[PDB]
Short mmCIF file of C-alpha atoms in Angstrom, two decimals:
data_model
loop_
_atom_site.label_atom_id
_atom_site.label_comp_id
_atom_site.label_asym_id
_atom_site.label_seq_id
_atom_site.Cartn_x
_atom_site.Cartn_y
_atom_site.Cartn_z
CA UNK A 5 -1.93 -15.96 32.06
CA UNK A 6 -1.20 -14.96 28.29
CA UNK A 7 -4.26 -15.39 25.87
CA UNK A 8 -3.40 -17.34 23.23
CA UNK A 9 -3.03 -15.69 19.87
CA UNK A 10 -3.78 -16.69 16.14
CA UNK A 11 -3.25 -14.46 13.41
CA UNK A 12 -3.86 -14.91 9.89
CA UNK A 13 -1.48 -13.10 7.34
CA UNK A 14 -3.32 -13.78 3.90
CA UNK A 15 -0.08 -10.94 2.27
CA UNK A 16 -1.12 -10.09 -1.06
CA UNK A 17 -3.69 -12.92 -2.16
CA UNK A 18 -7.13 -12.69 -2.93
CA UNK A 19 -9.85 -11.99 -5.37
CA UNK A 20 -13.53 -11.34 -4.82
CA UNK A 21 -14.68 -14.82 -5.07
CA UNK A 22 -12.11 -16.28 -2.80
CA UNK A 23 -12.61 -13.99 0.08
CA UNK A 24 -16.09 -14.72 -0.45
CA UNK A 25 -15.40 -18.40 0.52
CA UNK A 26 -12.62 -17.77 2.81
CA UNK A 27 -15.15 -15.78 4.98
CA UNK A 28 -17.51 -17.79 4.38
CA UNK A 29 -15.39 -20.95 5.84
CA UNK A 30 -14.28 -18.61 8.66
CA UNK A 31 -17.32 -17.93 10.19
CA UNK A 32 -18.66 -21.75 9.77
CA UNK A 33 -15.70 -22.77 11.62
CA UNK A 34 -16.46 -24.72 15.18
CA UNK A 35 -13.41 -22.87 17.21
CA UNK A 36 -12.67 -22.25 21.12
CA UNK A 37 -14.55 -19.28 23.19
CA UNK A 38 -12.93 -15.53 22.35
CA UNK A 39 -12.11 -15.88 26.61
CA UNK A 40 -9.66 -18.79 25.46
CA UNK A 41 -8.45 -17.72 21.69
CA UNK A 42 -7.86 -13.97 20.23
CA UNK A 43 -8.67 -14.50 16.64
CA UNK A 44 -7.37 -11.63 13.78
CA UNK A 45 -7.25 -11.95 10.09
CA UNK A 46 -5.15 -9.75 7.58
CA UNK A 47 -6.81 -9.27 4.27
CA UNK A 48 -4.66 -6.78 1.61
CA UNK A 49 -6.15 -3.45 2.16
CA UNK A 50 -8.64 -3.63 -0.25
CA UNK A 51 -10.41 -6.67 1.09
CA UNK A 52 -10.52 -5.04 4.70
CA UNK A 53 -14.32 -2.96 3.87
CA UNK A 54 -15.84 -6.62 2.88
CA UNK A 55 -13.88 -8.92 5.03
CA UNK A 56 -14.62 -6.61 8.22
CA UNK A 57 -18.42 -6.10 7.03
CA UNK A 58 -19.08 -10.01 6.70
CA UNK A 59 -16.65 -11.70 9.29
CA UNK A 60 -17.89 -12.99 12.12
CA UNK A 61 -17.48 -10.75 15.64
CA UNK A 62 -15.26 -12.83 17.58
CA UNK A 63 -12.30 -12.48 14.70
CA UNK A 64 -11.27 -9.19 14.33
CA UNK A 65 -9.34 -7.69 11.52
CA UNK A 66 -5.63 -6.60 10.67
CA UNK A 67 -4.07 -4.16 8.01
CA UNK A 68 -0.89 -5.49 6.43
CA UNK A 69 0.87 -2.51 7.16
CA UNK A 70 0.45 1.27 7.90
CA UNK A 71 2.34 4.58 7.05
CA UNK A 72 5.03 5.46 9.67
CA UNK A 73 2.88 8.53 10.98
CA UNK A 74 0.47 11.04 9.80
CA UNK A 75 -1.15 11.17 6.77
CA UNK A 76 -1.02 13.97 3.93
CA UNK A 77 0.98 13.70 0.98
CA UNK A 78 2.11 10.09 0.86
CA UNK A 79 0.85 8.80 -2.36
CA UNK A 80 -0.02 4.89 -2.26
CA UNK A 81 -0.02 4.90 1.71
CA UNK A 82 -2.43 3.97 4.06
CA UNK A 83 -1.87 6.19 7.79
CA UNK A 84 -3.05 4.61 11.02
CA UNK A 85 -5.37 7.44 11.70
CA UNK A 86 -7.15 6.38 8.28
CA UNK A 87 -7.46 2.76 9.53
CA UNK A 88 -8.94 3.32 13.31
CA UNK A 89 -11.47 5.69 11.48
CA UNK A 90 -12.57 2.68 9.51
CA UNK A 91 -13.00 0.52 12.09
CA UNK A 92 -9.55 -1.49 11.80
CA UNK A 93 -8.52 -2.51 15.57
CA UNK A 94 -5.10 -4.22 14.28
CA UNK A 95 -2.22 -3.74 12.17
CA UNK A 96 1.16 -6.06 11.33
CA UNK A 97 4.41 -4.15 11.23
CA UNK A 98 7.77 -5.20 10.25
CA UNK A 99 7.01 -8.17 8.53
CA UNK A 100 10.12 -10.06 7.19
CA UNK A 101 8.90 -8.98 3.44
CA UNK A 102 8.77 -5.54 4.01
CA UNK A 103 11.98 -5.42 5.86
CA UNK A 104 13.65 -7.21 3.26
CA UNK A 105 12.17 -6.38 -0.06
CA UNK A 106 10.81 -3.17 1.19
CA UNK A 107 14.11 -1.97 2.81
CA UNK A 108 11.91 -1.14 6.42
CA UNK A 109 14.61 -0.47 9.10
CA UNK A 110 14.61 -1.42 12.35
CA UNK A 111 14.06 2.23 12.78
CA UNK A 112 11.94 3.07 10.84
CA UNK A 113 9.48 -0.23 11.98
CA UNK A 114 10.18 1.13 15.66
CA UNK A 115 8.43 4.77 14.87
CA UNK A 116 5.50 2.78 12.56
CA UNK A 117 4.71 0.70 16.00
CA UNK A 118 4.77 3.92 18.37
CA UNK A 119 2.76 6.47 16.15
CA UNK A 120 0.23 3.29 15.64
CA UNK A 121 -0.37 2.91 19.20
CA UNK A 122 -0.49 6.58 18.88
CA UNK A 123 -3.07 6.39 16.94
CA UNK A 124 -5.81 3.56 18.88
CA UNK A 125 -4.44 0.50 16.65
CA UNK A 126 -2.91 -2.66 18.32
CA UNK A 127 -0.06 -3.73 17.23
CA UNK A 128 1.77 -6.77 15.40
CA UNK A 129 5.46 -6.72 15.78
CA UNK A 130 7.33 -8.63 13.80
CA UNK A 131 10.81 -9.61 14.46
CA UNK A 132 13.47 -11.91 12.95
CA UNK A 133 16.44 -13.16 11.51
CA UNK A 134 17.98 -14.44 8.30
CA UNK A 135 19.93 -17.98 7.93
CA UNK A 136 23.23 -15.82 7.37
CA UNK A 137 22.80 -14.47 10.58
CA UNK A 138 21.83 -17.63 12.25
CA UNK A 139 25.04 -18.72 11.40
CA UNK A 140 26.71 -16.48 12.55
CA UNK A 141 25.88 -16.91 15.20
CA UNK A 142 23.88 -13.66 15.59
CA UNK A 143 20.16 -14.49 16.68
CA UNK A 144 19.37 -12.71 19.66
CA UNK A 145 21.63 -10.12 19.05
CA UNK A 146 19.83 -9.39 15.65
CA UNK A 147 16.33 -10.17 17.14
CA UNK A 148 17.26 -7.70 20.42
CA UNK A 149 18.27 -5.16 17.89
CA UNK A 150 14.87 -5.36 16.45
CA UNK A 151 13.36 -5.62 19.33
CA UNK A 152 15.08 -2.46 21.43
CA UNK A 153 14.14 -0.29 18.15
CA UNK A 154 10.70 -0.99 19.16
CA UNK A 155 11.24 -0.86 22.71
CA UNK A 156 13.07 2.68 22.76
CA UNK A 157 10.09 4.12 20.95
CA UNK A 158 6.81 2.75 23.25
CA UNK A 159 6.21 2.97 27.07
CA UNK A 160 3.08 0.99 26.76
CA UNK A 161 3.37 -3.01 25.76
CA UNK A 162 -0.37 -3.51 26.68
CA UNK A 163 -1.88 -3.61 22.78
CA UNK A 164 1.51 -5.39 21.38
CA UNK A 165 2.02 -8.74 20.37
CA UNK A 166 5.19 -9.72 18.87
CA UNK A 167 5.87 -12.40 15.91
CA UNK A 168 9.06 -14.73 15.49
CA UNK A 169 9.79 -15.35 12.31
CA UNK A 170 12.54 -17.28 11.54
CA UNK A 171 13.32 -15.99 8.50
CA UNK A 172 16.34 -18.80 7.84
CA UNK A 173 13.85 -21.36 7.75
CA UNK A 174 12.41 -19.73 4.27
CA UNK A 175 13.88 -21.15 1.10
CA UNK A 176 16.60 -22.66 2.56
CA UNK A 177 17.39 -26.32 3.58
CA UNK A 178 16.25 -25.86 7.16
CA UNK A 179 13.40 -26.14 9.17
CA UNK A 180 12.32 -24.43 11.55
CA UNK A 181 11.36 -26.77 14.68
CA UNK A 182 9.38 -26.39 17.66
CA UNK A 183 12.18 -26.64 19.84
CA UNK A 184 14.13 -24.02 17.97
CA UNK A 185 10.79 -22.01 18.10
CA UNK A 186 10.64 -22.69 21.52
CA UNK A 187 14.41 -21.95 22.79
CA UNK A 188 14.05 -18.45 20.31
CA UNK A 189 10.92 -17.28 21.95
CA UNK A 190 12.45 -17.89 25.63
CA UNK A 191 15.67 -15.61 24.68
CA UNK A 192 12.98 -13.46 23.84
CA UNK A 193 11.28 -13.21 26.94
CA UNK A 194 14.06 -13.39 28.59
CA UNK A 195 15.10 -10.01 26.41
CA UNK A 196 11.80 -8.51 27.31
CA UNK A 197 12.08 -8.95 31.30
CA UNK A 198 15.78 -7.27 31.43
CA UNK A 199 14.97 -4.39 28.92
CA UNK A 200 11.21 -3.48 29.06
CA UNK A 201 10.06 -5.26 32.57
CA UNK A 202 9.16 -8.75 34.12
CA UNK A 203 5.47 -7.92 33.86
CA UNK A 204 5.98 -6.36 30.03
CA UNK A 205 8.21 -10.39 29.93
CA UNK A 206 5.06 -12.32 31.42
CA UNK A 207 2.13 -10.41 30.14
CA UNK A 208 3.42 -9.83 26.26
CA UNK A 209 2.09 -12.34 23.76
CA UNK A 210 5.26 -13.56 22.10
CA UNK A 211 3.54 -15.89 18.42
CA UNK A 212 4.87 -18.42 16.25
CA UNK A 213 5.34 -16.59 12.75
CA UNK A 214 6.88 -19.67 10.83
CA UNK A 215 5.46 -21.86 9.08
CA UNK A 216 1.87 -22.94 10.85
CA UNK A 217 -0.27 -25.95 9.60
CA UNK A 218 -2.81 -28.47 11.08
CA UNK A 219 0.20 -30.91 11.29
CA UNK A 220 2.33 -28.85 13.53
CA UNK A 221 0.04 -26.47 15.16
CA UNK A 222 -0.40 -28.54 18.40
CA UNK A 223 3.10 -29.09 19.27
CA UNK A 224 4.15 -25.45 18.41
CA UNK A 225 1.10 -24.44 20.69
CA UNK A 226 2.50 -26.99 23.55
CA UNK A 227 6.13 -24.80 23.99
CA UNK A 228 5.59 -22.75 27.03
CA UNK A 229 7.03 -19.16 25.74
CA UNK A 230 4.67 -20.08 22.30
CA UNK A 231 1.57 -17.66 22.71
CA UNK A 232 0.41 -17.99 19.23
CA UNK A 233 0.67 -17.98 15.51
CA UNK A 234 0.95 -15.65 13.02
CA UNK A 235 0.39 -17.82 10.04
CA UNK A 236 0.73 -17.62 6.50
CA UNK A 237 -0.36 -19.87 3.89
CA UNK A 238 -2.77 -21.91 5.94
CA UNK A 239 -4.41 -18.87 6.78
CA UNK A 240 -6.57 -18.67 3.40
CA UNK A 241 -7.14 -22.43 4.06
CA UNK A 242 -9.89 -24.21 5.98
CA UNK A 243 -6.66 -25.68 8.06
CA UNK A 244 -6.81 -22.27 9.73
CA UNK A 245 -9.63 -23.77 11.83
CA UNK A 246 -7.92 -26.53 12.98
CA UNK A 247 -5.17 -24.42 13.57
CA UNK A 248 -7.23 -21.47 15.78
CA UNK A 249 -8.04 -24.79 17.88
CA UNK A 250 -4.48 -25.66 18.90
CA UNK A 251 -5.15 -22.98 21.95
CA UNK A 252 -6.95 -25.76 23.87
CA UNK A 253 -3.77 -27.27 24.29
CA UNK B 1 -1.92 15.14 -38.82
CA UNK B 2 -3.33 11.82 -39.11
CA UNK B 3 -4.13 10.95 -35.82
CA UNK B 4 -7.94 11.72 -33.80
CA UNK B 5 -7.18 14.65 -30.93
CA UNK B 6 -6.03 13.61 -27.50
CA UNK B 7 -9.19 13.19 -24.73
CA UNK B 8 -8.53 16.14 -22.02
CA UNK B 9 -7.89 14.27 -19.15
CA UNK B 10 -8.03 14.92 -15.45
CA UNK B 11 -7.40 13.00 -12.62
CA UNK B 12 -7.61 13.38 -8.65
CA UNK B 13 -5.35 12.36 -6.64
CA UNK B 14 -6.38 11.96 -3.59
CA UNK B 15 -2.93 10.77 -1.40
CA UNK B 16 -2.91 9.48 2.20
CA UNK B 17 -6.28 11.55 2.59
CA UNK B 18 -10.25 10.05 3.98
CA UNK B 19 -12.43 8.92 6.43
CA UNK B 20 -15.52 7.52 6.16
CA UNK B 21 -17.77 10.57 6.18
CA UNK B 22 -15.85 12.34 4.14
CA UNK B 23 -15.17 10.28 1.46
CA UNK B 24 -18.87 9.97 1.61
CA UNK B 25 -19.22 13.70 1.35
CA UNK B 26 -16.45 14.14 -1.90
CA UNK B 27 -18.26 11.23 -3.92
CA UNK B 28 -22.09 12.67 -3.49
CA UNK B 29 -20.60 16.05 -4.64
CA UNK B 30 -18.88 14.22 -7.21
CA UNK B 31 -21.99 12.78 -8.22
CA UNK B 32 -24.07 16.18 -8.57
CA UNK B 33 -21.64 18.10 -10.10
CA UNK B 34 -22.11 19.32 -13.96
CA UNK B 35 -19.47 18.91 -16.10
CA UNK B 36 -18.86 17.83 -19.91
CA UNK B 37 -19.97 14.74 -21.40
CA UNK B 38 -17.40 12.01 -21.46
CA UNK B 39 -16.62 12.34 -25.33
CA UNK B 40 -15.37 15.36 -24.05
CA UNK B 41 -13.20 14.64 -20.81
CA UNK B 42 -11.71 11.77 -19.30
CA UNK B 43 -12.35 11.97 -15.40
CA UNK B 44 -9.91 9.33 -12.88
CA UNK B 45 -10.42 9.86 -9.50
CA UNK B 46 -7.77 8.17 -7.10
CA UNK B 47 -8.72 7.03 -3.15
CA UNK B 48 -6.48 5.32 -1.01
CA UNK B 49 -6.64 1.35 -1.27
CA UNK B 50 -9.48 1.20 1.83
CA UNK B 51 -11.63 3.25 -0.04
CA UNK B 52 -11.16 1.79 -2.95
CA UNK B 53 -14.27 -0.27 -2.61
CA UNK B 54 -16.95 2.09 -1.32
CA UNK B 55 -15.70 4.80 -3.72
CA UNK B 56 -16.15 2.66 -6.61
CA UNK B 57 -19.75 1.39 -5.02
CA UNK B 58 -21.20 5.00 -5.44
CA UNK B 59 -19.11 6.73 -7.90
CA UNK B 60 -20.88 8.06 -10.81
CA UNK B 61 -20.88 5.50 -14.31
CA UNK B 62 -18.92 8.05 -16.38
CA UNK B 63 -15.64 8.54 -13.75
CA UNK B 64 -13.67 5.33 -13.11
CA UNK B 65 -11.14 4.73 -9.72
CA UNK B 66 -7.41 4.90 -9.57
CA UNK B 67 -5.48 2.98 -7.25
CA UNK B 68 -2.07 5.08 -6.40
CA UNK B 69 -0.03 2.10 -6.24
CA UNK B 70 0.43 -1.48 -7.07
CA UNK B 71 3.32 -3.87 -6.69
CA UNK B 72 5.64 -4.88 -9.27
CA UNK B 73 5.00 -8.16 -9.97
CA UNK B 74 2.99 -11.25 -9.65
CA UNK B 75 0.96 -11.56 -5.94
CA UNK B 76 2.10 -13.69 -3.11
CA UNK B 77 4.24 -13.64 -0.43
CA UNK B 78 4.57 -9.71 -0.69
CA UNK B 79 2.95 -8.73 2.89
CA UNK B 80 1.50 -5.18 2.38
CA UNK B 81 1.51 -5.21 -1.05
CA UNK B 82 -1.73 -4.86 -3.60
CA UNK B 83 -0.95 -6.64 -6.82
CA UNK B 84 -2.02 -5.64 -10.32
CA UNK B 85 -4.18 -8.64 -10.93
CA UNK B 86 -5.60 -7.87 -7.48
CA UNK B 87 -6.80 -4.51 -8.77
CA UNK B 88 -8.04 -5.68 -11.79
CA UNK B 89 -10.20 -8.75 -10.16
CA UNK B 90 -11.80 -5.45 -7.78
CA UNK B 91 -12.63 -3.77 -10.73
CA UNK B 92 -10.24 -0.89 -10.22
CA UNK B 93 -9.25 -0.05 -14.00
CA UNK B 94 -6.67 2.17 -13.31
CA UNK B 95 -3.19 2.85 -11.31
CA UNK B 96 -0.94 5.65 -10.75
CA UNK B 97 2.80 4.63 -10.91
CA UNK B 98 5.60 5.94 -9.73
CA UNK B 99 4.35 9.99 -8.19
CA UNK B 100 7.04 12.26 -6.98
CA UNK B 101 6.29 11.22 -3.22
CA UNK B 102 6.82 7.47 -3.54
CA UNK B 103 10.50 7.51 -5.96
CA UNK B 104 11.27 10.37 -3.04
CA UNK B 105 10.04 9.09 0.26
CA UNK B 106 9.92 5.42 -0.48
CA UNK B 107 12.74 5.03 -2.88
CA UNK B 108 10.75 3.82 -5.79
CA UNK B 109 13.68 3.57 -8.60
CA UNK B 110 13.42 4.13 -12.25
CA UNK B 111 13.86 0.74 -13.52
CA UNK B 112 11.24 -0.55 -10.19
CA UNK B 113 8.59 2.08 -11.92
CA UNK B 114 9.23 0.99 -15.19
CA UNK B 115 8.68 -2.76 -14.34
CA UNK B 116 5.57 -1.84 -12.31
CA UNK B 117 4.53 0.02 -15.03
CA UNK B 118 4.82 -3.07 -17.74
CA UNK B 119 3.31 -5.43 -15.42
CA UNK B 120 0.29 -3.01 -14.66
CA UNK B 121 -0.43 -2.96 -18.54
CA UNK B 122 0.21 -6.79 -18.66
CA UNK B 123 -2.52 -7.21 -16.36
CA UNK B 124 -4.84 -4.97 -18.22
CA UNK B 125 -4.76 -1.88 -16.12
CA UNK B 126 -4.72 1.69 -17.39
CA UNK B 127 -1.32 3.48 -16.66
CA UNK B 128 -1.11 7.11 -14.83
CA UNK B 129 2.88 7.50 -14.94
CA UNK B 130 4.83 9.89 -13.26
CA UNK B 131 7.75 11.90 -14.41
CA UNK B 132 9.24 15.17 -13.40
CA UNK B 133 12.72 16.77 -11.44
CA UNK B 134 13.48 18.21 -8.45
CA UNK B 135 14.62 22.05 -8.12
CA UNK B 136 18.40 20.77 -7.62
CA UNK B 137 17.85 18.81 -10.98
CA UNK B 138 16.57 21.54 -12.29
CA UNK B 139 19.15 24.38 -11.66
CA UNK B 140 21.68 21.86 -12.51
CA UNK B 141 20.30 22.14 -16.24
CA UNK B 142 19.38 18.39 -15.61
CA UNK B 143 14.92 18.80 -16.15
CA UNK B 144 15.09 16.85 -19.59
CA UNK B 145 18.51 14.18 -18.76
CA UNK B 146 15.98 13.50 -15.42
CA UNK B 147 12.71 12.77 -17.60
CA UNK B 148 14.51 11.20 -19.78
CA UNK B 149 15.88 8.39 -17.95
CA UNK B 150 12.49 8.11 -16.20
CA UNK B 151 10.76 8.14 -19.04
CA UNK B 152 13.31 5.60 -20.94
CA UNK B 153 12.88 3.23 -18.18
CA UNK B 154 9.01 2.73 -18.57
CA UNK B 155 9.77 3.11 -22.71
CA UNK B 156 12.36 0.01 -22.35
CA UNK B 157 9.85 -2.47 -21.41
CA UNK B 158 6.32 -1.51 -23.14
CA UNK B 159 5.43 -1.51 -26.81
CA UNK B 160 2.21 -0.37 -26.85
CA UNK B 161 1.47 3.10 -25.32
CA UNK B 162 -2.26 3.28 -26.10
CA UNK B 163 -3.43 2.85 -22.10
CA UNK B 164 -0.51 5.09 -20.65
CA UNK B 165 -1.19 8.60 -19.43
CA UNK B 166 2.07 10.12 -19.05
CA UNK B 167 2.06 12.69 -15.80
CA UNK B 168 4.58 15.37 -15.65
CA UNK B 169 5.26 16.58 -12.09
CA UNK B 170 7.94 19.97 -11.70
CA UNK B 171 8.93 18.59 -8.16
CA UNK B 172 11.12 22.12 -8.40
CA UNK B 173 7.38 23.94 -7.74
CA UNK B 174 5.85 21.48 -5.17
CA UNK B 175 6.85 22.67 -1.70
CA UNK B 176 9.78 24.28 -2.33
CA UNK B 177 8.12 27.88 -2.30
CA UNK B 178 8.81 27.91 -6.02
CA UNK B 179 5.77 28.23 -8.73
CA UNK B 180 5.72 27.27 -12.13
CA UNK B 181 4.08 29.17 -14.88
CA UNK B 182 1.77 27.39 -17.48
CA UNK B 183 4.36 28.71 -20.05
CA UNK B 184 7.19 26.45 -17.94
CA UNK B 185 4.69 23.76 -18.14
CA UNK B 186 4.40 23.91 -21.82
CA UNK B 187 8.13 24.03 -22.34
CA UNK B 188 8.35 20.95 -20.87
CA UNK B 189 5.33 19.09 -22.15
CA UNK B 190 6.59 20.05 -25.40
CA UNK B 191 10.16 19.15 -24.40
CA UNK B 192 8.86 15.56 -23.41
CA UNK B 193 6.73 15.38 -26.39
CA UNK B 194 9.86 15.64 -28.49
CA UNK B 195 11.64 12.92 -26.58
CA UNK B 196 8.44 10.15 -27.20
CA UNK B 197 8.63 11.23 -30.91
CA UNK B 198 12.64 10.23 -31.27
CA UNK B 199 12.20 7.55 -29.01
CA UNK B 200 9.08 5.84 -28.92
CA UNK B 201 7.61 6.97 -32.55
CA UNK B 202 6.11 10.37 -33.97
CA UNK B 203 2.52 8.32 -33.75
CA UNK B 204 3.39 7.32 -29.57
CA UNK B 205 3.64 11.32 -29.48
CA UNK B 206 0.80 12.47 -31.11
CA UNK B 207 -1.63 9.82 -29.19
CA UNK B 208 -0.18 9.91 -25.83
CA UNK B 209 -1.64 11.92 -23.25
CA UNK B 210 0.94 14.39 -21.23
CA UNK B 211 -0.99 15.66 -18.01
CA UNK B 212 0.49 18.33 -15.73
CA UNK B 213 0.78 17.17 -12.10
CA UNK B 214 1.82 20.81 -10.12
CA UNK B 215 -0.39 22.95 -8.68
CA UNK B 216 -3.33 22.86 -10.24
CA UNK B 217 -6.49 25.20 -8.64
CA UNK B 218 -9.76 26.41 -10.37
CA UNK B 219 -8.38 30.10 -11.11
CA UNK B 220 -5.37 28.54 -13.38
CA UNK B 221 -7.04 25.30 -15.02
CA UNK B 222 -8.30 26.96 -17.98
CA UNK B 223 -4.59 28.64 -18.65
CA UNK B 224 -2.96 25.36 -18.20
CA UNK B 225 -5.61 23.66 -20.33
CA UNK B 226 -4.88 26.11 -23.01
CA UNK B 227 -1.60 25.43 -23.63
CA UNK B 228 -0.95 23.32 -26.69
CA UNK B 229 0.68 19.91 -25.15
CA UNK B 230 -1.17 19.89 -21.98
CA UNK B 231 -3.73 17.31 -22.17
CA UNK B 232 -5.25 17.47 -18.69
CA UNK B 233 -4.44 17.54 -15.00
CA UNK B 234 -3.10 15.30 -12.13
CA UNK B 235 -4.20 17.36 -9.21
CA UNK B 236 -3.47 17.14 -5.35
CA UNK B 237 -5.43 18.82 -2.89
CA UNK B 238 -8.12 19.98 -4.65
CA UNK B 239 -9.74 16.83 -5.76
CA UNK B 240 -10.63 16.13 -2.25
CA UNK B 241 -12.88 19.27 -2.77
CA UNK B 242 -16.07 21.19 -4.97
CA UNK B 243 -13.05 23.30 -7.00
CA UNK B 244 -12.23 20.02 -8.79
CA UNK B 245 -15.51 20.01 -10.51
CA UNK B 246 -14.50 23.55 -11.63
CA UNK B 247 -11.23 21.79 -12.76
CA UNK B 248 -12.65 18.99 -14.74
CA UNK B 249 -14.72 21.62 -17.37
CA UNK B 250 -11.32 23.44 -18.54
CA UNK B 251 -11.86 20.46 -20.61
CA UNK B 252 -13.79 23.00 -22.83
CA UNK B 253 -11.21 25.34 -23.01
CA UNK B 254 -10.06 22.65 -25.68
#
């Protein structure tokens, strides 16, 4: 039904040499058919000219971000417009860093996800929440939030995937396990079917954002509302291989 | 009087502007344009990160690449974010910190500025830093309180000023249908001048470079250039096109 989905988010790592063997690793890499796995990697913007020159066709590429619409002046931005010129087919928006240490708004991610659609790029989503609001009993009510500020701003889910992350399972005494993944990313779809539609609910990739290695890959990819991975560390790893592979489960 | 004059300076910012073919396009004009030598003028140009590469790939020897941002610390788990060390690994020598658009439109605060600032040095990038106040600032007799607590925030956490370039933007004359004179623009140069010789030291002030970041065009470069503590440009718009070639040889009006 849903083609399974691995992302890799490499956030803001990376010099010349080590993209140089990170490619190099990538394309060497013995990994499932692109009609069984959907394969994207995220460089920082100024590793996306080399990485999309030298990385094999079946893995496409992702910007980390984009501006929130059109470009002009916007010192230190990158617009949507500027990254479907170049060739970029992908972008992630709302990651858990920028809404947190970047102050994005729910808002604000919302209008980034419509005007990049806009625009020709597919689309990321990232939702999400924090360990105080866990507590609190607040999950899908904070993760809906997120989710309707998307949802209110799009009429077209086709070229969307959206990330979990659960952001109380970073630096704090918990972790995150597949079964929590699993029960999250049902209330999601469950979200989906009642706000957006059933066939938005059963046709929308709905990924893994936590934390992804070769030890827990297969069980994650097991869960049946788990379409994927966004994954972090392990992406600039040759684990990421082993982790693109969990789709044959 | 001890110190050797200040290099004329001009860079080009180019903001959210590019595509492919016409990056191509600026750079090859770039490349066959005359202007004087580099003993004579200091020439930055400034591409979005995605062009960084290709830009600096083709760009003539004697101009070197800006980035127009960085983060403001260390590289990791920042998702988005291009980190000083980052830049310097590319082979992008320099970075402009903290323009009018990013403290306005993405809430860039004095103290964040002034830490990106010392970490860009720390890394061993070059500095283009931003200063300047908005028309309300500026009717409220605030221009110099404004600078000053810009300028004091970047001042706070570096000793050694010899790879800033200090950018003065009048905020008050960029799309607000207000202009500013190149006799406003030496008031405050001078004005900011002042403030580095008090509170940095009267050798900081002498060496530093003050650039003027309004509107600068090819029919008032040479007026700008003339005045006594402008040192150069930051432009906008026009250093996506030919007229910043005219820009860069008001370096002779020196």
């Amino acid at each position: 039904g849903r083609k399974f989905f691995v992302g890799g988010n490499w956030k803001c790592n990376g010099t010349t040499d080590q993209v140089e063997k990170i490619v190099k690793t990538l394309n060497e890499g013995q990994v499932p058919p692109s009609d069984v796995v959907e394969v994207v990697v995220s460089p920082p913007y100024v590793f996306l000219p080399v990485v999309k020159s030298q990385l094999r066709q079946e893995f496409h590429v992702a910007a980390q971000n984009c501006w929130v619409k059109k470009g002009g002046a916007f010192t230190g931005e990158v617009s949507a417009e500027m990254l479907v010129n170049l060739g970029v087919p992908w972008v992630i928006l709302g990651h858990s860093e920028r809404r947190a240490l970047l102050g994005e708004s729910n808002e604000f991610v919302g209008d980034k996800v419509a005007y990049a659609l806009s625009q020709g790029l597919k689309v990321i989503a990232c939702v999400g929440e924090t360990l105080e609001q866990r507590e609190a009993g607040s999950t899908m009510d904070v993760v809906a939030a997120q989710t309707k500020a998307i949802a209110e701003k799009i009429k077209d889910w086709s070229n969307v995937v959206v990330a979990y992350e659960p952001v109380w399972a970073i630096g704090t005494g918990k972790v995150a396990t597949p079964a929590q993944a699993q029960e999250v990313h049902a209330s999601l779809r469950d979200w989906l079917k009642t706000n957006a539609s059933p066939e938005v609910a059963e046709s929308t990739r709905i990924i893994y954002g936590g934390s992804v290695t070769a030890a827990n890959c297969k069980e994650l990819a097991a869960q049946p509302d788990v379409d994927g991975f966004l994954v972090g560390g392990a992406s600039l790893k040759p684990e990421f291989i082993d982790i693109i592979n969990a789709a044959t489960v």
